[PDB]
Amino acid sequence: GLLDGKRILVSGIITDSSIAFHIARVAQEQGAQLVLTGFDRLRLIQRITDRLPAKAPLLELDVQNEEHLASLAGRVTEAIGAGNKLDGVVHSIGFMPQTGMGINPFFDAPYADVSKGIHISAYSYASMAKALLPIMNPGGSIVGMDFDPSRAMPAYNWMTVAKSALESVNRFVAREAGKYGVRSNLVAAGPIRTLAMSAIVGGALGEEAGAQIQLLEEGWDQRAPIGWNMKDATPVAKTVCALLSDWLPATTGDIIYADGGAHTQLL
Amino acid sequence: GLLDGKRILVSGIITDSSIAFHIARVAQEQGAQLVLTGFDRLRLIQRITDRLPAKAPLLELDVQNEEHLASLAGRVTEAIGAGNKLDGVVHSIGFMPQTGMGINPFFDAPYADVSKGIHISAYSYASMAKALLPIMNPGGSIVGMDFDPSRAMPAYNWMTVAKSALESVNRFVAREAGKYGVRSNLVAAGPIRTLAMSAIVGGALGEEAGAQIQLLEEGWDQRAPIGWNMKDATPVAKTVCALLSDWLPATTGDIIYADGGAHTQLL
Amino acid sequence: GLLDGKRILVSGIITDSSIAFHIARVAQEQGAQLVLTGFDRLRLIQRITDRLPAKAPLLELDVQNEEHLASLAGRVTEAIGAGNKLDGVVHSIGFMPQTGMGINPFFDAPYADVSKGIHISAYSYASMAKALLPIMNPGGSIVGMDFDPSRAMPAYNWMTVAKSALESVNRFVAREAGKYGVRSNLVAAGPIRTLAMSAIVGGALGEEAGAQIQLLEEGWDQRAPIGWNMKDATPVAKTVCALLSDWLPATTGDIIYADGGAHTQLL
Amino acid sequence: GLLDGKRILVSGIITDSSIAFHIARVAQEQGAQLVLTGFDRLRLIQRITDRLPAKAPLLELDVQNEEHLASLAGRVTEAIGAGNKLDGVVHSIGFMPQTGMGINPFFDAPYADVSKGIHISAYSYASMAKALLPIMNPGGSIVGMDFDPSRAMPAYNWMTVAKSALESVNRFVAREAGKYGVRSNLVAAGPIRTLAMSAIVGGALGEEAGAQIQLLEEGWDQRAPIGWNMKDATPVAKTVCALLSDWLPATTGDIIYADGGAHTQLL
Numbered sequence A, B, C, D: 001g002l003l004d005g006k007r008i009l010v011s012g013i014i015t016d017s018s019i020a021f022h023i024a025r026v027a028q029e030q031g032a033q034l035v036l037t038g039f040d041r042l043r044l045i046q047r048i049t050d051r052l053p054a055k056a057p058l059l060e061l062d063v064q065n066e067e068h069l070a071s072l073a074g075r076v077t078e079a080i081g082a083g084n085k086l087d088g089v090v091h092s093i094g095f096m097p098q099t100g101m102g103i104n105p106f107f108d109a110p111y112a113d114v115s116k117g118i119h120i121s122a123y124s125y126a127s128m129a130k131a132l133l134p135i136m137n138p139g140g141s142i143v144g145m146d147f148d149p150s151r152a153m154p155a156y157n158w159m160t161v162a163k164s165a166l167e168s169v170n171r172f173v174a175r176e177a178g179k180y181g182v183r184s185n186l187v188a189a190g191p192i193r194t195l196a197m198s199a200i201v202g203g204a205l206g207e208e209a210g211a212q213i214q215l216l217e218e219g220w221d222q223r224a225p226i227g228w229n230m231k232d233a234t235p236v237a238k239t240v241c242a243l244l245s246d247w248l249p250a251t252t253g254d255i256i257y258a259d260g261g262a263h264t265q266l267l
């Protein structure tokens, strides 16, 4: 298995359509031993993760909670056993208040909302690395989830800004992680029909936002030389596993695009 | 003159070595009528700006102050006269708390500090555009100051992250500004020996941070095919004026590099 | 005038819808004294350039002709007067054989064709700089015309490759030009309905190629936050003049996007 | 094994310090069945490849030889057996005449030399894909070797231009390869001390070129958050294997940086 014997923390499972659910599933299929972290609805997440091919301890982690972070590494050490360290960390956490997205005018997002979004979506990549690098093995890998923010787009608004911040954070995290013999990288995924995405497409953030995202999705598959299946998170999970593996050992502070190649094509 | 008859708001003068001081001076040399905005030390800024080739009304603008922003356009209209609108807006505002920079470990910057930095340095580009676009003429130009954050670097830490955010914000601001027939662009300047920069070089944020920035500056001039004079903000002021002019009329959501060409060269 | 007193060589006029025709016209409107170079059909080009606001000596330059290049600087010196040097050079030259474009399969372009295309479209940027830098003044500016090749696109095929090469060449030209106190930059223009473009849209390189380019043009204006008018080369001519001016004095080895901001927007 | 059962053509072995030698070795260690191609010195290459963990048919391929390419797929089919197709293709071919590199002035490289360099180094990526895609399986992977040309650098001169062309070609190859369910990607490696590199460092292309490359190598390891060992091609071979695998299944027309993360860091 690709991740045989590796111990890997996977954050960001909330439903069985979470990208992190698929990351966790593929990692397990590939021999990894997981510790999961979950935000807020731990009973729900436990029930969801019961469906993973293997049992995995689930730890509460609200990335905005200083104490959760301060206790994180001890709790993980408790879960994987004293003397054992993590080989991988998957950050699959993102949030932006509604005012920072969709048809709420870009200018109308109050900074408190944007800040909370950037906190959860960007800064927490650094928070997590800070918490976990002390308990990571040399040759370890931190992976976060990105959505290519190099160009502006409708609807994603301040979440795109948050991702721009995240990409910058990742480069700094790589500098820190390198001290530990650890890589830090993002996977920039194509659009995936998670519950939230489906809700946006269905107009939850305004009809025009829904229409634009639908157009975005369609254009993505069109541009993607190998196509893009927004209903299938597996290619993205595999890519995350690729980075968690020993097979990209010279790649760090970097972004791997698991988007069907859409970003390399204009039309 | 390049900016003859144009009315332009210039934020960010704090000392006579502020990049915005030079932007204001060059703009005036080029025929622009200025409104200045200043943060906090208005008496100081007035005295500094007395040295500009022309008188310019100075308005208080704390970009974190909602009321300042809410009143901004009325105050500007008051200053330039009812029925007159702005042709240009220069955002030359940046701040990051000390914990977000220098030898304070990257991981040790508390999010409240980072957030304040991103507020002033990134989000305020959107705040300013929100406040001023209603009083900007078609063919207008918003320009913000950038420091190329595409690669991580020592010492600049969360300010680089803030600039990554700013670049993303600028692309969204362009979408909004385009509705007004207004361009929005950043000038990514090479390093300029402002007071703060000199202080960092002198070790104000730690000796190693100072040493790294010094190396950064030296490498910049070396890489720059036309050299880079960190003691001369004029080439950057001119570039900002170029964007404020009618001479880059098809450029928006974009970044103009006024850095000696350093970013185009590896070594 | 923006280019008052500057002496500027403008290559690439072939018809009155040549981007270089508009560059030459705007430069003249802005006070520049021009020397034109023309390829092959000098009688035609003379007649076309008779329409420029001012007379300009026209010199033959086949960029693939070593002797033309070897004699170029002497001929220019002859035209502008001994003791006078150029302040600006505009490279607005591009060609790719039909096999390298349109619906001719990408794989089917014979290398001899591609090579000729890269010769005229990329290498000649270096050839021209080699020929002219000895007769350029400090503070001079070389500008070439680019079409953003960072992402692949239908129909443009090997011309996109040629532009990728050109952008790389420009960065090297900047290193050389910097020795002379000369900047070297590209303007990446949006699509302009030159005769050739109109012919491609009309199906000259295959119906599907025509259909794709039409879609490309439509998407460009849609994405452009300030719109894009493919029938108007003036915004691009102005941008070239901006780079020929003293107003981007710290920009070199670089690309200025005169494309309505289209490249900064995904959708 | 990562590449278990996959049939993969590996071009570009010339010595046991060829990056392709290490790609071939790692691929074999990972279960791949190889067909090798070799240029010119087939007796030498056979003797070199005798050292690979497994036997592999060696086929002559001069990428500038139309007949070699025209016969290539039949010869490969002969070697792997009728009814069997390739799963992977590794392009590890590069050449630039001396005049296009080192201290030979950039402007002094005759186009015939540059063209030959671009032919072998860029166009041949398309030639190889053209030859081999008809005999590649869905889910296949074409990988070429890149050296990040996004910024100009000393000494590499027209080879950097060739790599810029190659990166553009790769994006087009992805469009074609996608029709076959095949990915096309580049690995941008850090500098590797191949024989040629060592010769350049030793001054084979001029002392200043040697000095600059040495500085380049040193800076690379310094910038690389996880360091860079130019004497070790394994991390790059592994990265190529990662792309040949099923583990980056949504990545195409893309560049994977196996450079220690050096390109993500300024200083």
Ligand SMILES: NC(=O)C1=CN([C@@H]2O[C@H](COP(=O)(O)OP(=O)(O)OC[C@H]3O[C@@H](n4cnc5c(N)ncnc54)[C@H](O)[C@@H]3O)[C@@H](O)[C@H]2O)C=CC1
Pocket (backbone or CB within 6 Å): A011, A012, A013, A014, A015, A017, A018, A019, A020, A038, A039, A061, A062, A063, A064, A091, A092, A093, A094, A095, A120, A145, A146, A147, A188, A189, A190, A191, A192, A193, A194, A196, A197
């Ligand atoms: N769905 C899509 O189209 C794409 C999503 N992404 C990114 O993938 C990552 C995963 O999101 P998805 O799986 O799409 O959605 P999701 O909603 O399944 O996952 C987001 C996760 O973030 C967690 N989260 C929110 N606030 C948190 C906090 N304070 N502390 C800890 N965790 C918190 C949520 O509990 C949830 O598990 C995010 O970074 C997202 O931006 C990237 C590209 C595309």
Ligand SMILES: NC(=O)C1=CN([C@@H]2O[C@H](COP(=O)(O)OP(=O)(O)OC[C@H]3O[C@@H](n4cnc5c(N)ncnc54)[C@H](O)[C@@H]3O)[C@@H](O)[C@H]2O)C=CC1
Pocket (backbone or CB within 6 Å): B011, B012, B013, B014, B015, B017, B018, B019, B020, B038, B039, B061, B062, B063, B064, B091, B092, B093, B094, B095, B120, B145, B146, B147, B188, B189, B190, B191, B192, B193, B194, B196, B197
């Ligand atoms: N000095 C350098 O090397 C470079 C600086 N820059 C950027 O140029 C811009 C101008 O900075 P400099 O002239 O270098 O330094 P500066 O310190 O002269 O200017 C920064 C300005 O930001 C203003 N500011 C801070 N907080 C504010 C708030 N809450 N509201 C309104 N204004 C506030 C300050 O009053 C000051 O006028 C900044 O965006 C900076 O990041 C960009 C590239 C290089």
Ligand SMILES: NC(=O)C1=CN([C@@H]2O[C@H](COP(=O)(O)OP(=O)(O)OC[C@H]3O[C@@H](n4cnc5c(N)ncnc54)[C@H](O)[C@@H]3O)[C@@H](O)[C@H]2O)C=CC1
Pocket (backbone or CB within 6 Å): C011, C012, C013, C014, C015, C017, C018, C019, C020, C038, C039, C061, C062, C063, C064, C091, C092, C093, C094, C095, C120, C145, C146, C147, C188, C189, C190, C191, C192, C193, C194, C196, C197
């Ligand atoms: N039309 C468009 O949509 C865009 C064009 N460009 C570029 O702008 C530049 C100008 O082209 P356009 O004005 O569009 O077309 P054009 O056909 O008016 O100009 C191309 C010029 O290249 C010259 N040329 C061709 N072979 C030559 C040789 N061996 N020696 C000297 N000159 C030679 C032609 O004589 C012609 O004057 C080209 O680099 C083109 O790629 C860039 C972006 C968009």
Ligand SMILES: NC(=O)C1=CN([C@@H]2O[C@H](COP(=O)(O)OP(=O)(O)OC[C@H]3O[C@@H](n4cnc5c(N)ncnc54)[C@H](O)[C@@H]3O)[C@@H](O)[C@H]2O)C=CC1
Pocket (backbone or CB within 6 Å): D011, D012, D013, D014, D015, D017, D018, D019, D020, D038, D039, D061, D062, D063, D064, D091, D092, D093, D094, D095, D120, D145, D146, D147, D188, D189, D190, D191, D192, D193, D194, D196, D197
């Ligand atoms: N050594 C380095 O620092 C780096 C090299 N690369 C690239 O890696 C690839 C492999 O080169 P290296 O292993 O470094 O050197 P190498 O000299 O071992 O390999 C180059 C190969 O190109 C082949 N070649 C040359 N002309 C050919 C033709 N007409 N037909 C077929 N093959 C031909 C040579 O026979 C040789 O096998 C090249 O694309 C090179 O640019 C990329 C990054 C760094």
